[PDB]
């Protein structure tokens, strides 16, 4: 069955941008998906997107700008303390100059640098570079 809808959301975006496409459809929509997409967008990786209402779990149309190398999910949502973040970013990010790990903390869904600024740990949702 369909478990971890965010995994399907992130695998669909990765597979379309390998093909050089300009738009991708994501179903079903979810608020974790929307927050993750916003985090990706504010860093200049995807661009504007739009939610379609179905009186159900809606769907999303995302515009692609060709700037994405990889976006992936981590399952299960491991707990990350602020002293164990360096190992995670060494394991997952391609360099110390670019790439982001996306976590969910009690202050919101953010990336690994805003979490360091706010001095908080959380649970790892995924990564993108």
């Amino acid at each position: 069955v369909r478990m971890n809808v965010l995994a399907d959301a992130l695998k669909s975006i990765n597979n379309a941008e390998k093909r050089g496409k300009r738009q991708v459809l994501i179903r079903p929509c979810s608020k974790v998906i929307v927050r993750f997409l916003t985090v990706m967008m504010k860093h200049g990786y995807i661009g504007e997107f739009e939610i379609i209402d179905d009186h159900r779990a809606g769907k999303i149309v995302v515009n692609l700008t060709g700037r994405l190398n990889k976006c992936g999910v981590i399952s299960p949502r491991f707990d990350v303390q602020l002293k164990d973040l360096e190992k995670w970013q060494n394991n997952l990010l391609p360099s110390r100059q670019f790439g982001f790990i996306v976590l969910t903390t009690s202050a919101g869904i953010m990336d690994h640098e805003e979490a360091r600024r706010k001095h908080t740990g959380g649970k790892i949702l995924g990564f993108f570079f």
């Binding site: 997409l37 661009g47 997107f49 739009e50 939610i51 379609i52 209402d53």
Partner: protein
């Protein structure tokens, strides 16, 4: 006609009751308005100069109000000149319970009393007699959201002159940016 919970009417929500008073016994709607009553009134500046009146009515009377809304709005816009009339049901929003709350949340909050649920009903009440056939939310680069609402063409020539007013009401009632479109077909 005005029966607020705070029992405080003033110069402008008394005028709405005054206007309804003549129609009560001087229109064909004789027994279709005796048992109904409004609960609030307001005047709003929209479209850089225009004015729009929102009339708040009890929820249990909503369908009785909008069963005659077409004639009421038609006949209520003749007294005051160049102002759009909008009827909205008075709905309550119960705050989301938290881990630090008072013992007022004794019984579970109904989802009819949810913020999103009342914002999605305020829109339907605002857009009458037309119906909503679609809804889209554009998330833009700065992170802001814009709602795009598709309306039926059956009432297109009846409501399309009020679309600039509809956004003006919704921005203060809700706090959101909304545009209205008329699609091709279903």
């Amino acid at each position: 006609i005005v029966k607020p919970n705070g029992e405080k009417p003033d110069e402008f929500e008394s005028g709405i009751s005054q206007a309804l008073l003549e129609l009560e016994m001087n229109s064909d709607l004789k027994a279709q308005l005796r048992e109904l009553n409004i609960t609030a009134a307001k005047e709003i500046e929209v479209g850089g100069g225009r004015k729009a009146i929102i009339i708040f009515v009890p929820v249990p009377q909503l369908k009785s109000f909008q069963k005659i809304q077409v004639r009421l709005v038609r006949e209520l816009e003749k007294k005051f000149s160049g102002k759009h009339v909008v009827f909205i049901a008075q709905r309550r929003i119960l705050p989301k319970p938290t881990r630090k709350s008072r013992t007022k949340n004794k019984q579970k909050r109904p989802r009819s009393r949810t913020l999103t649920a009342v914002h999605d009903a305020i829109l339907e009440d605002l857009v009458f007699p037309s119906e909503i056939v679609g809804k889209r939310i554009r998330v833009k680069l700065d992170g802001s959201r814009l709602i795009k609402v598709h309306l039926d063409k059956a009432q297109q020539n009846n409501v399309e002159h009020k679309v600039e007013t509809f956004s003006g009401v919704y921005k203060k009632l809700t706090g959101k940016d909304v545009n209205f479109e008329f699609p091709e077909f279903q």
